Short mmCIF file of the N, C-alpha and C atoms (twelve columns), coordinates in Angstrom:
data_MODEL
# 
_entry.id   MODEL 
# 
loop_
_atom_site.group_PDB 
_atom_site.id 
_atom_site.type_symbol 
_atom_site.label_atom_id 
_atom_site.label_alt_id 
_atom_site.label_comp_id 
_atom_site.label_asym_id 
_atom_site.label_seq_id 
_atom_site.Cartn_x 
_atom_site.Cartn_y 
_atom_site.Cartn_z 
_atom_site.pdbx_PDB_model_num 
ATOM 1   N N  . UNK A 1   138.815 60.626 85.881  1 
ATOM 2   C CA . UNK A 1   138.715 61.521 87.018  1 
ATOM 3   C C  . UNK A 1   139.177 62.933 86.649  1 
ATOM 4   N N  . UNK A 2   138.756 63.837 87.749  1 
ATOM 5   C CA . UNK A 2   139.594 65.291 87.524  1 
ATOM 6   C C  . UNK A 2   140.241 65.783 88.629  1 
ATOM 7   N N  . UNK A 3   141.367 65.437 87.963  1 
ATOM 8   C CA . UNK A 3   142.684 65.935 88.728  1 
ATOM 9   C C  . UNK A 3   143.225 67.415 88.500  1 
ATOM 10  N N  . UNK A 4   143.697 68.436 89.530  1 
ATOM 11  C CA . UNK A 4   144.043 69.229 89.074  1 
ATOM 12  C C  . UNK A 4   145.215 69.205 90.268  1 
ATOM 13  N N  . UNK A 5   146.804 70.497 88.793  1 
ATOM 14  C CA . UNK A 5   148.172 70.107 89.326  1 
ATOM 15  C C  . UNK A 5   147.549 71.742 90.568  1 
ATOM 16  N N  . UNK A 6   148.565 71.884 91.083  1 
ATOM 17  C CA . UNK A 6   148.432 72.274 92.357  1 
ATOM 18  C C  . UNK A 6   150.125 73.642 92.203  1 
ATOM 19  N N  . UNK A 7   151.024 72.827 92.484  1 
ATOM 20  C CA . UNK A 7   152.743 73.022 92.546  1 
ATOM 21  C C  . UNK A 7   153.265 71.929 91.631  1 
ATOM 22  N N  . UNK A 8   154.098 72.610 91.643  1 
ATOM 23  C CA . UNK A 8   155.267 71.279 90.743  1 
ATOM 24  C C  . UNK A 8   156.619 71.429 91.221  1 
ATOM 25  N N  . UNK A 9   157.028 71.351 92.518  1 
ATOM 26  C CA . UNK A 9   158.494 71.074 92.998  1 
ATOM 27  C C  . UNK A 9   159.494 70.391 93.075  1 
ATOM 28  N N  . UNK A 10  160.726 70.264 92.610  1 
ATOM 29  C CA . UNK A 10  161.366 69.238 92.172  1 
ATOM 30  C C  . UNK A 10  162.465 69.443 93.279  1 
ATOM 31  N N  . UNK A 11  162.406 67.893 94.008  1 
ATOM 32  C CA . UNK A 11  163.698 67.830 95.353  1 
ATOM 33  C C  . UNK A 11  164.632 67.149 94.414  1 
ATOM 34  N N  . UNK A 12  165.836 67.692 94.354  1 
ATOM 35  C CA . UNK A 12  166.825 67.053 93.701  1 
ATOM 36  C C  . UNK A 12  167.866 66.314 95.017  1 
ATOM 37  N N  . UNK A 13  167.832 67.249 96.009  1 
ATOM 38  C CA . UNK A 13  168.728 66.769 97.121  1 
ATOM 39  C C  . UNK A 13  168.492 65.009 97.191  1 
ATOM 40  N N  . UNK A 14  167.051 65.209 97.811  1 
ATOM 41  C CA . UNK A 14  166.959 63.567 97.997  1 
ATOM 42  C C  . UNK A 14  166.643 62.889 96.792  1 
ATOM 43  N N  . UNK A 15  166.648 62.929 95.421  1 
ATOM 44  C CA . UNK A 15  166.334 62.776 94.060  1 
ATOM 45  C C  . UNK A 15  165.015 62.258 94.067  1 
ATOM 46  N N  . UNK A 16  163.972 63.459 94.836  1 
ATOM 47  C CA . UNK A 16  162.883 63.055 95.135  1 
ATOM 48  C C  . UNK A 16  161.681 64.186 94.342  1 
ATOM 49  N N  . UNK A 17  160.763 64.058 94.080  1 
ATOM 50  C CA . UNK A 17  159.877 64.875 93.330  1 
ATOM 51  C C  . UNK A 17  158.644 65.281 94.214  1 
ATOM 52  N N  . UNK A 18  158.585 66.441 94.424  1 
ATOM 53  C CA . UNK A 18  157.235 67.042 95.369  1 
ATOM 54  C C  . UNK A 18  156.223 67.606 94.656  1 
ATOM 55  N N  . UNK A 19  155.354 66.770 94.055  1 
ATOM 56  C CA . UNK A 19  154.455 67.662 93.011  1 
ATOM 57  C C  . UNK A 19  152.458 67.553 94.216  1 
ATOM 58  N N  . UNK A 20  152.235 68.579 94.009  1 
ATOM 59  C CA . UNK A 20  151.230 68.437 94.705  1 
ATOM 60  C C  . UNK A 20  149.450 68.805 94.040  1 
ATOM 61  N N  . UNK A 21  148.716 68.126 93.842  1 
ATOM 62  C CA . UNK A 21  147.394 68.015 93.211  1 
ATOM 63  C C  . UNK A 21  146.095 67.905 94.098  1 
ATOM 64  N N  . UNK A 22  145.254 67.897 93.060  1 
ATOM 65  C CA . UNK A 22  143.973 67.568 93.838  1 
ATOM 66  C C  . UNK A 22  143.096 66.582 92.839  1 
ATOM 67  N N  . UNK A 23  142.532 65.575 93.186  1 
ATOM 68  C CA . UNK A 23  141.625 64.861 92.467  1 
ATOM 69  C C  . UNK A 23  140.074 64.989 93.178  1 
ATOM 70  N N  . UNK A 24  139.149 64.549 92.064  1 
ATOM 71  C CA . UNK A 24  137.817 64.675 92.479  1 
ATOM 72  C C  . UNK A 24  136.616 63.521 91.940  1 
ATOM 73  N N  . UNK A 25  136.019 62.594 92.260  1 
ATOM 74  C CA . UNK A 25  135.141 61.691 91.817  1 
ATOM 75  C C  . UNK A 25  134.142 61.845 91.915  1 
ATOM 76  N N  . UNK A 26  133.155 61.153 91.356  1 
ATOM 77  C CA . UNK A 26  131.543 61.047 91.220  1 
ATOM 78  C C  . UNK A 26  131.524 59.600 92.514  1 
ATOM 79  N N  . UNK A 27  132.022 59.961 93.796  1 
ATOM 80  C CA . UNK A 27  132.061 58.495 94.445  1 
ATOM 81  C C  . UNK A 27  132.934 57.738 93.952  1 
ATOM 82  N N  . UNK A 28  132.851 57.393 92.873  1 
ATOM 83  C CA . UNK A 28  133.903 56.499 92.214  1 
ATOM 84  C C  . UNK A 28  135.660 56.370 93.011  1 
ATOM 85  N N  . UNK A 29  135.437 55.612 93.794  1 
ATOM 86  C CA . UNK A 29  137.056 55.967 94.786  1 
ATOM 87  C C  . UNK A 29  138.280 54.671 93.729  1 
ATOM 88  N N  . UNK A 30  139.229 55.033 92.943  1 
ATOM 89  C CA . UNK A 30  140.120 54.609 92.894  1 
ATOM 90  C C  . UNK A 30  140.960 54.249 93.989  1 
ATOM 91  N N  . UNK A 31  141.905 53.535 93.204  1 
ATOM 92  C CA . UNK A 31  143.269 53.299 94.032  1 
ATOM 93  C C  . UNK A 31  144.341 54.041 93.860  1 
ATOM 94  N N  . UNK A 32  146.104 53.768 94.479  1 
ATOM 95  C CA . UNK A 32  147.409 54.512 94.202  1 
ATOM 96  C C  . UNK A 32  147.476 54.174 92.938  1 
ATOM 97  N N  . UNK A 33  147.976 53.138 92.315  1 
ATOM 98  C CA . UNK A 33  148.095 52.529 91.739  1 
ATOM 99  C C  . UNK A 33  146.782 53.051 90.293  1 
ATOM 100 N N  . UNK A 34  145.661 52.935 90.553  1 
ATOM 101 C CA . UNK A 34  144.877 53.067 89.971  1 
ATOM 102 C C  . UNK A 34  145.027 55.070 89.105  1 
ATOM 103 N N  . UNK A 35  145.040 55.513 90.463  1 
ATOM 104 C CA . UNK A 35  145.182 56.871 90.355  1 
ATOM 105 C C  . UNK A 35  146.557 57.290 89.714  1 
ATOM 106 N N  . UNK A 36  147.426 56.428 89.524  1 
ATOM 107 C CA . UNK A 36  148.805 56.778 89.309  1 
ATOM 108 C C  . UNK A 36  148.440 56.263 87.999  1 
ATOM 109 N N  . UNK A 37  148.046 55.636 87.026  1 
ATOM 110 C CA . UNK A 37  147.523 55.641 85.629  1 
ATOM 111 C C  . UNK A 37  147.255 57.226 85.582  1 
ATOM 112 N N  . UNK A 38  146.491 57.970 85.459  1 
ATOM 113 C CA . UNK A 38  146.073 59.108 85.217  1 
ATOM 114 C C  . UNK A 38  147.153 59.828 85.449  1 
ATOM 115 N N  . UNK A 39  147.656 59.682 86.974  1 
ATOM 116 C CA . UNK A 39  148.427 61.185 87.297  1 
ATOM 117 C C  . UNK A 39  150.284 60.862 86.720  1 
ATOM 118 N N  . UNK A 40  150.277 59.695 85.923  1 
ATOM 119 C CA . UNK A 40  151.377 59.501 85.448  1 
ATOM 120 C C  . UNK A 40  150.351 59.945 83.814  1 
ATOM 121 N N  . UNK A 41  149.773 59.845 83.196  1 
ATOM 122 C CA . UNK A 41  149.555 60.879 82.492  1 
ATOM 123 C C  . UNK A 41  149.619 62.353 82.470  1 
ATOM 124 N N  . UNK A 42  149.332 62.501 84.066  1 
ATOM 125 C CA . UNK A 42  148.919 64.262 84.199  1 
ATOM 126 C C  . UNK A 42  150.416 64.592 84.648  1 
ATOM 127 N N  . UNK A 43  151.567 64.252 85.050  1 
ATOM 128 C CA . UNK A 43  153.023 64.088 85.475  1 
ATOM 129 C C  . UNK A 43  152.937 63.969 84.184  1 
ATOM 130 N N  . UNK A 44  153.030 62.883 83.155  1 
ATOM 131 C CA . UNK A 44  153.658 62.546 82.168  1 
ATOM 132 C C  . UNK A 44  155.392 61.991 82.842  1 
ATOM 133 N N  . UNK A 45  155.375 61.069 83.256  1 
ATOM 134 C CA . UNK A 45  156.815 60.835 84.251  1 
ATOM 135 C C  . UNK A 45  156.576 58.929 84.006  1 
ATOM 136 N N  . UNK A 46  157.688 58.758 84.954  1 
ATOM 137 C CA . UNK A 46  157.716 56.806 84.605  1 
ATOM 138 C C  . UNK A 46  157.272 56.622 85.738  1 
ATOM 139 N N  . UNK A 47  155.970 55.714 85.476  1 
ATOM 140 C CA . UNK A 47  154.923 54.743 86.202  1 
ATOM 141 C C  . UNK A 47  155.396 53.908 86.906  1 
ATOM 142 N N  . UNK A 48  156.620 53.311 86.215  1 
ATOM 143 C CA . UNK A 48  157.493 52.389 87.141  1 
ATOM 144 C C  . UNK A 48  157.707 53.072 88.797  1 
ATOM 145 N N  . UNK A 49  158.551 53.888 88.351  1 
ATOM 146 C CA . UNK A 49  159.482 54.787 89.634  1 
ATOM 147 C C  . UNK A 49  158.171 55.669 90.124  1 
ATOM 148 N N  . UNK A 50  156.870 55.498 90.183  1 
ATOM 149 C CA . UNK A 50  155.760 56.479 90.557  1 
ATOM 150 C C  . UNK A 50  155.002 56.297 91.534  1 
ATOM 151 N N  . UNK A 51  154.755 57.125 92.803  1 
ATOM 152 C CA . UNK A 51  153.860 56.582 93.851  1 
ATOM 153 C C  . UNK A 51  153.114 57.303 93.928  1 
ATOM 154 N N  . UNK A 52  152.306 57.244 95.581  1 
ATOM 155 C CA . UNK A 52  151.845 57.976 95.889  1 
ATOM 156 C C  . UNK A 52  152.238 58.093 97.729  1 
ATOM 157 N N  . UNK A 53  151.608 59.533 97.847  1 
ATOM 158 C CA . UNK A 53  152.532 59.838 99.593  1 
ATOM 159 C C  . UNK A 53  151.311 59.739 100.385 1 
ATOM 160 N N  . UNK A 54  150.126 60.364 100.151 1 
ATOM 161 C CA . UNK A 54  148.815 60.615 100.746 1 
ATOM 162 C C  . UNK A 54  147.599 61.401 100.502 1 
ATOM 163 N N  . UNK A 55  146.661 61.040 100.966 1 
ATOM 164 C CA . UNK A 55  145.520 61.873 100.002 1 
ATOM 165 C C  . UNK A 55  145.001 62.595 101.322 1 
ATOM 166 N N  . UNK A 56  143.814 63.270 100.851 1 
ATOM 167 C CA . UNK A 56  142.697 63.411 101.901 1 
ATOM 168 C C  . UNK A 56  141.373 63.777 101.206 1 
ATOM 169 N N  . UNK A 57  139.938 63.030 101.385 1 
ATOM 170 C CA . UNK A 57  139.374 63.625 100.284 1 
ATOM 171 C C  . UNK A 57  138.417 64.668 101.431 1 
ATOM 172 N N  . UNK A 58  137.932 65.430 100.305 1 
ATOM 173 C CA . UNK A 58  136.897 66.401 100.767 1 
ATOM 174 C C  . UNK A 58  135.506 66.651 101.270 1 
ATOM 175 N N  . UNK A 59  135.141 67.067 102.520 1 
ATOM 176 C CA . UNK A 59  133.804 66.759 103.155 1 
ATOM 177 C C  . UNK A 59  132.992 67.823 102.006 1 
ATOM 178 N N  . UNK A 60  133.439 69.415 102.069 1 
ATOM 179 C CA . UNK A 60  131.922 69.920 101.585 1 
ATOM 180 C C  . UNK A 60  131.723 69.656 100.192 1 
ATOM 181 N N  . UNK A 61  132.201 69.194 98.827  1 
ATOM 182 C CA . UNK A 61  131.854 68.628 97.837  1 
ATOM 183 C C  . UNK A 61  132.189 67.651 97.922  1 
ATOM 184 N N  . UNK A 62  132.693 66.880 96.207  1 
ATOM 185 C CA . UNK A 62  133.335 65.583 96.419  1 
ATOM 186 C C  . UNK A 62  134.515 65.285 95.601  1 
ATOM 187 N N  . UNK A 63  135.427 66.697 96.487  1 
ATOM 188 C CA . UNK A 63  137.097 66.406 96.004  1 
ATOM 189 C C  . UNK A 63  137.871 66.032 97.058  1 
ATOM 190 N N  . UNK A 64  138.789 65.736 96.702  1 
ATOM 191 C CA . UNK A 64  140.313 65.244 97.709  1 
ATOM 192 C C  . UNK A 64  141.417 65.683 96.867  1 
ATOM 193 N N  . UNK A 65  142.263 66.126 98.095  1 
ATOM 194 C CA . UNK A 65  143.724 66.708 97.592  1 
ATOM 195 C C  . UNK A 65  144.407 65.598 98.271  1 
ATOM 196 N N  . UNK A 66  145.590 65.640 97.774  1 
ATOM 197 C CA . UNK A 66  146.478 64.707 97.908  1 
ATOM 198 C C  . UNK A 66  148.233 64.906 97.824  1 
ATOM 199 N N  . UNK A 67  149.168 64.932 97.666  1 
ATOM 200 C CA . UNK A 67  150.007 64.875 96.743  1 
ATOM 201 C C  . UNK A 67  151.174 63.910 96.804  1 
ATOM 202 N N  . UNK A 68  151.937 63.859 95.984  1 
ATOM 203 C CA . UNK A 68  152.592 62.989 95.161  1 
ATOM 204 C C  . UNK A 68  153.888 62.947 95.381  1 
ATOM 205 N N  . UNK A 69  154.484 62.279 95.080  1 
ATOM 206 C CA . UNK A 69  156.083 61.821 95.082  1 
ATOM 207 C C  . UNK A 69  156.487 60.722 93.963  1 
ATOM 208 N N  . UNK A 70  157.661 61.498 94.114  1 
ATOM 209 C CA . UNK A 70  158.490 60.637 92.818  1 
ATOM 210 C C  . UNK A 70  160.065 60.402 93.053  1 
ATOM 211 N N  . UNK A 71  160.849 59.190 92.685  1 
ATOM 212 C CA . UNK A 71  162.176 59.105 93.105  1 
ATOM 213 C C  . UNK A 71  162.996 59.039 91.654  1 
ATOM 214 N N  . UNK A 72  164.157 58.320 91.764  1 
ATOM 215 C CA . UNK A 72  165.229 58.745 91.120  1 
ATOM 216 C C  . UNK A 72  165.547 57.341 90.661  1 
ATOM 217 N N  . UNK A 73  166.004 56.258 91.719  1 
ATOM 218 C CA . UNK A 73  166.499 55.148 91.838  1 
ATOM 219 C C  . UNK A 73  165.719 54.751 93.339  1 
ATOM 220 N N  . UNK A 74  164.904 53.445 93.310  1 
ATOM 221 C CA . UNK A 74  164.268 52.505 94.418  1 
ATOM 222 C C  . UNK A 74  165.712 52.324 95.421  1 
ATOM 223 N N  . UNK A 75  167.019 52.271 94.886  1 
ATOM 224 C CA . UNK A 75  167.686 51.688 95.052  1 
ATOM 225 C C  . UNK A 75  168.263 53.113 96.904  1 
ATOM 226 N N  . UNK A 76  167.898 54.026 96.276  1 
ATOM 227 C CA . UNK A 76  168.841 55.502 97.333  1 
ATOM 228 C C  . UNK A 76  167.315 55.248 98.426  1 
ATOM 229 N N  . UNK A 77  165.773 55.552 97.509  1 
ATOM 230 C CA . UNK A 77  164.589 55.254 98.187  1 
ATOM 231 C C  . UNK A 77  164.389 54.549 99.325  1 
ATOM 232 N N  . UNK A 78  164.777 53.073 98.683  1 
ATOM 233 C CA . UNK A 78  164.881 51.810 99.187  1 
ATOM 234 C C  . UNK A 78  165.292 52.394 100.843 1 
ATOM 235 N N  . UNK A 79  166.711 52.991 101.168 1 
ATOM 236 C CA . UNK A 79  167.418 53.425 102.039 1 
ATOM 237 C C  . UNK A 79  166.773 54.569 102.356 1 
ATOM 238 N N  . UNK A 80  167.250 55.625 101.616 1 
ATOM 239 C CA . UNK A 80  166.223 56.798 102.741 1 
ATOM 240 C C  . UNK A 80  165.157 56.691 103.464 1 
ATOM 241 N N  . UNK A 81  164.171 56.631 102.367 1 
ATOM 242 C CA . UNK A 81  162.351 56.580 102.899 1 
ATOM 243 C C  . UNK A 81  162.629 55.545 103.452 1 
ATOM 244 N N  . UNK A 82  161.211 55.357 104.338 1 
ATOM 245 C CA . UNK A 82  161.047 54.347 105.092 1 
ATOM 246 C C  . UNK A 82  159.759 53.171 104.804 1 
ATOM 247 N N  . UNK A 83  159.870 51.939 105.870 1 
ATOM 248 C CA . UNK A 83  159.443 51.282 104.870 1 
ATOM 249 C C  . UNK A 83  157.710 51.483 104.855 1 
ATOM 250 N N  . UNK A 84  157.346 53.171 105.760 1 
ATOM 251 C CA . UNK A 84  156.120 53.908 105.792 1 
ATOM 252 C C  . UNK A 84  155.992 54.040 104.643 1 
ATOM 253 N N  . UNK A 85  157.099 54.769 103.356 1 
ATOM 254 C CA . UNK A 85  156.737 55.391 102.373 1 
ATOM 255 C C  . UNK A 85  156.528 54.074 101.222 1 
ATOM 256 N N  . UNK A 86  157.480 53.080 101.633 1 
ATOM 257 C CA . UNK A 86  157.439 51.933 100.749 1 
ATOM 258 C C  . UNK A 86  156.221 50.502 100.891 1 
ATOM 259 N N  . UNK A 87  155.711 51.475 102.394 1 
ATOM 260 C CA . UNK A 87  154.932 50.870 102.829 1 
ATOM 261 C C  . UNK A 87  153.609 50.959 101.563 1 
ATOM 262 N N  . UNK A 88  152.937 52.383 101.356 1 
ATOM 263 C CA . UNK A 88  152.167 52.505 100.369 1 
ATOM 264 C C  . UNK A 88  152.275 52.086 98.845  1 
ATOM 265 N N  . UNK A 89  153.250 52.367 98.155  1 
ATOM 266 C CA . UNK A 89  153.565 51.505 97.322  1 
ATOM 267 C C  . UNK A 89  153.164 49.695 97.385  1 
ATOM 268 N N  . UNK A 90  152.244 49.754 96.247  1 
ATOM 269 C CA . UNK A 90  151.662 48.243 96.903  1 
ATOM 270 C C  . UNK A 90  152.776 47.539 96.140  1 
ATOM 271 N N  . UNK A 91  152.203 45.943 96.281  1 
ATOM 272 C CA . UNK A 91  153.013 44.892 95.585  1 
ATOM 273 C C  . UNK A 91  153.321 44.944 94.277  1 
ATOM 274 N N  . UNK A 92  152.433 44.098 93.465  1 
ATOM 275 C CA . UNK A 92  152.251 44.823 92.575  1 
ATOM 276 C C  . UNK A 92  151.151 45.032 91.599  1 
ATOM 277 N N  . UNK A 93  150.560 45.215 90.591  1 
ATOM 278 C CA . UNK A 93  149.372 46.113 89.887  1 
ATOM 279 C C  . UNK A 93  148.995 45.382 89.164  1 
ATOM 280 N N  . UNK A 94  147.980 45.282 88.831  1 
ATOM 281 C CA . UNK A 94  146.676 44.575 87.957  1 
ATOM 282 C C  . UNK A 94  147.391 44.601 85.929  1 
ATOM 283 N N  . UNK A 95  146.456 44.431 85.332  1 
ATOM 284 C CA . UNK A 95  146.702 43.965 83.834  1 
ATOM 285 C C  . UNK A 95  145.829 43.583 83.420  1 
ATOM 286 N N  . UNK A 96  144.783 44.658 83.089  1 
ATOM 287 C CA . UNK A 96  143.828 43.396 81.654  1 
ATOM 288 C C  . UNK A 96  144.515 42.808 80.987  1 
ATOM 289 N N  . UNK A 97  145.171 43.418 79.982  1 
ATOM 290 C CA . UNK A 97  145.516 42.651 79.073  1 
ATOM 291 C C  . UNK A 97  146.901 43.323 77.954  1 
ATOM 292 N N  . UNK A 98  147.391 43.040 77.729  1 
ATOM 293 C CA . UNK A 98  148.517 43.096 76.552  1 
ATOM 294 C C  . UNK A 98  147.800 44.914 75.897  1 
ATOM 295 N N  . UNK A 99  146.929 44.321 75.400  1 
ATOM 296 C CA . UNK A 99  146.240 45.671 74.574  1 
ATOM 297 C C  . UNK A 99  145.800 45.762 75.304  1 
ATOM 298 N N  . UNK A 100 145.418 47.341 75.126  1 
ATOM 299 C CA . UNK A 100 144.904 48.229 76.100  1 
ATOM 300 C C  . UNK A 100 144.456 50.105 75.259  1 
ATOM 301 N N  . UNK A 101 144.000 50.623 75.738  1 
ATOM 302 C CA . UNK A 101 143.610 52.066 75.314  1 
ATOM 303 C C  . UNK A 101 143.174 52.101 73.970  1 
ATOM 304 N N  . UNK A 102 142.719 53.293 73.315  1 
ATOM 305 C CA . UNK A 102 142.522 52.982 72.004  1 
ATOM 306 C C  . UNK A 102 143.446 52.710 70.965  1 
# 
């Protein structure tokens, strides 16, 4: 996909990360999870501790902006956010296989 970064704001108060982007598909609609492969490339940050907050995609071409969040410890998360934000965060994520990429 093509993602582009937007801002890059870092909440330290809530040890929370406000980075904000835009992605764009050929139709091709990913998932959080799915999309968080890439944008934990395009972050370069841990996949583990990585979500997503909300998207919206775009009527007059075929982009969507979105942006992103990132925590510190699940554990402060867990408690602050709610279980809206933990709500998106799915269960958990797929695996072809052991190997993977080139």
């Amino acid at each position: 996909m093509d993602i582009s970064i937007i801002s890059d704001r870092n909440n330290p108060l809530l040890q929370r990360r406000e980075i904000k982007f835009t992605v764009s598909f050929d139709a091709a609609t990913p998932s959080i999870k799915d999309v968080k492969m890439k944008l934990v490339a395009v972050l370069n940050a841990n996949k583990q501790v990585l979500v997503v907050d909300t998207l919206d995609q775009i009527f007059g071409k075929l982009e969507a902006e979105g942006y992103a969040k990132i925590y510190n410890d699940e554990k402060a998360m867990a408690t602050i956010e709610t279980k809206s934000v933990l709500e998106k965060n799915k269960i958990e994520e797929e695996a072809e296989a052991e190997v993977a990429e080139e």
